[PDB]
Structure 1
Amino acid sequence: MKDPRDVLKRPVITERSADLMTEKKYTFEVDVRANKTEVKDAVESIFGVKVDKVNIMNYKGKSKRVGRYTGMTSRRRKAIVKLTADSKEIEIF
């Protein structure tokens, strides 16, 4: 239980994400109940690279007004990993 592919959900592709990716940093969306250590091990196992540091952050939901109804979107958790200088680059397509 706690397979590593359950921690990572999907990559993040913006201008900021590519700017960071220029410097061997990669941005992911992870499960809302996973701490930095499982993120580190999961990245190590899935891709086979060397990890140096991990930084994590929490996001709240947003209010939307489609039609005459109102609601809220779901929370998010974002992680930024930094590979070492010798490690290969992860082929994020």
Structure 2
Amino acid sequence: SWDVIKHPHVTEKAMNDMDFQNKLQFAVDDRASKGEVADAVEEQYDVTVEQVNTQNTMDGEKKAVVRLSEDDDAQEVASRI
């Protein structure tokens, strides 16, 4: 059984999305839909997901850009792992 979240995608561009737009980025299973990514993320870090954007990368993986609600602080979440 394949899991949805593979690991946090951590790069300069990712940090910005995290500090400036309350967004977290993840490497996810390319079979996962935007909705399955939101659900998975909410149940792993207990937060509210507002929007999810996806991209099948040239690394053969899928990258997801998850924006959290104003109640959650991306920086703090990312900092506990």
Q: For structure 1, which runs of at least 5 residues remain unmatched after alignment? A: 62-74
Moved over 2 A (4+): 87-91
**1:92 equivalent in structure 2:** 78
Identify which of 31, 34, 45 aligns with 1:33. 31
TM-score, normalised with respect to structure 2: 0.83
Structure number having the greater helix percentage: 2
Q: Give me the CA root mean square deviation.
A: 1.7
Q: Would you say 1:10 and 2:21 are equivalent positions?
A: no
How far, CA to CA, are the matches of 1:26 and 1:88 in structure 2?
Answer: 10
TM-score, normalised with respect to structure 1: 0.73
1:56-92: per-residue Cα shift (whole Å, max 9, x none)?
Answer: 011235xxxxxxxxxxxxx111000001112344522
Q: For structure 2, which runs of at least 5 residues remain unmatched after alignment? A: none
